[PDB]
Amino acid sequence: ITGTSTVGVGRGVLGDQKNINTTYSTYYYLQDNTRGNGIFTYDAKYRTTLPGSLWADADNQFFASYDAPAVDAHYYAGVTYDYYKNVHNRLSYDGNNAAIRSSVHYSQGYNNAFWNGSQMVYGDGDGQTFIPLSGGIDVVAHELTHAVTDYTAGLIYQNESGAINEAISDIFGTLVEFYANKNPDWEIGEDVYTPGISGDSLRSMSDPAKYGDPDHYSKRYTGTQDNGGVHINSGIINKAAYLISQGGTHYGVSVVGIGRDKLGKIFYRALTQYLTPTSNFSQLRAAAVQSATDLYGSTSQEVASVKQAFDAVGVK
Ligand SMILES: CC(C)C[C@H](NP(=O)(O)CNC(=O)OCc1ccccc1)C(=O)NCC(C)(C)C
Ligand SMILES: [Ca+2]
Ligand SMILES: [Ca+2]
Ligand SMILES: [Ca+2]
Ligand SMILES: [Ca+2]
Ligand SMILES: [Zn+2]
């Protein structure tokens, strides 16, 4: 909407206070004009028709319980935008400052979040499996990264390409979490998963097997559930990414860690210059090796570490 840029204040899902960029025109809207062509957050009002209504508030204060998922979707979309712009020189998900749209309060008891081809969508959770999913910065960045993937590599959402698609979202979700630097880890969704259980998460990149996800190609799922295991086989690539960044010895194969920033550069380059819609795990290895070669040189530690990590997870 047309209005003047303002700054509201509210509390997120976890009870933390934050400032948010809003727009004033009669109401204060969750419309952040400071980033690209805007970040826009909508109320789906417990229904499934999208996007719903652009979030309107009378006083620019967002401290109601109902406000919390909107505050976080809006704010964490901003952080994710900043990460891509500042770290990778990418302007929004399409590289041309596309408006970023999110809807919260989607459906009832909805234990998921997704990119629907055009926008991000967040359930509130059922209060047991999840609390409102926009409360996780890794979750928000995971969803926005699906848009990035769709505009770039275009990885088809099934089988190996789909597992790469998933891992890319977990990898950048985690890198954005580190970028924001509030309780960062290599776990996925820990801030919004199972409020009654401390210390767990939806997935682990450092040890995917802790939740039964494969950490080696020999343990890949080959059935038809979950689009051929896109959220399962992602563990193999998540583990490789974790090893590239942090190092470790995995099934007897030692990897020298090169750090998060280089992991991010290598995978961002792979995603945007080498991966295609049908890339499989072997092709991702090749893409990552080539990306590291481009950035650091064929004889570099970075290249050696990428090879070590894929060796460790059984991807040749
Ligand atoms: C980061 C977590 C919190 C959310 C994450 N959601 P996602 O974006 O991967 C769900 N993806 C999904 O719904 O794709 C299917 C799809 C395809 C085209 C248009 C709309 C929807 C996830 O891992 N979902 C899978 C669960 C088993 C955890 C629910
Ligand atoms: Ca208010
Ligand atoms: Ca965390
Ligand atoms: Ca996390
Ligand atoms: Ca939990
Ligand atoms: Zn996903």
The answer to whether 136 touches 59, Cβ cutoff 8 Å, is no
* CA end-to-end distance (rounded Å), the chain: 51
Q: Which atom of ligand 1 is nearest to the CA of 139?
A: 1
Ligand 1 near 231 CB (within 6 A): yes
Write the DSSP string, 176-221. HHHHHTSS--SEESTTTB-TTSTT--SEESS-GGGGT--SSGGG--
Specify burial of residue 164 (Cβ count, 10 A radius: 0-12, 13-18, 19+).
buried
Ligand nearest to the CA of 182: 3
Domains recognised in the chain with CATH numbers: 6-154 (3.10.170.10), 155-315 (1.10.390.10)
- Minimum CA distance residue for ligand 1 atom 13: 114
| Residue with tokens 């990414």, as numbered in its chain | 241
Q: Which atom of ligand 1 is nearest to the CA of 130?
A: 3
Specify burial of residue 214 (Cβ count, 10 A radius: 0-12, 13-18, 19+).
buried
| β-bridge pairing 39-43 and 100-106 | parallel
Ligand 1 near 97 CB (within 6 A): no
59 is in an annotated binding site: yes
> How far lies 28's CA from each of 63, 65, 67, 105, 144, in Å?
14, 17, 13, 19, 24
Two tokens, residue 254: 């030692």
Taking the centre of ligand 1 as the mean of its atom positions, its distance from the CA of residue 167, in whole angstroms, is 12
Q: Which atom of ligand 1 is nearest to the CA of 138?
A: 1
Q: Which atom of ligand 1 is nearest to the CA of 173?
A: 1
Ligand 1 near 142 CB (within 6 A): yes
- Minimum CA distance residue for ligand 1 atom 18: 116
The H or E element containing residue 135 is: none
Q: How many CB atoms lie within 10 A of CB 205?
A: 28
Of residues 74, 88, 105, 143, which has the active-site annotation?
A: 143
Report DSSP state, residue 66.
G
Active site residue 143: yes
Which method was it determined by? X-ray
Taking the centre of ligand 1 as the mean of its atom positions, its distance from the CA of residue 250, in whole angstroms, is 28
Of the candidates 222, 215, 104, 103, the residue with the CA atom closest to the CA atom of residue 167: 215
Ligand nearest to the CA of 174: 4
Of residues 105, 216, 231, 250, which has the active-site annotation?
A: 231
Distance of CA 282 to the CA centre of its chain: 23
The amino acid sitting at 133 is L
DSSP E strands: which ranges in 38-189? 39-43, 53-54, 56-57, 61-62, 100-106, 113-115, 120-123, 187-188
Ligand 1 near 199 CB (within 6 A): no
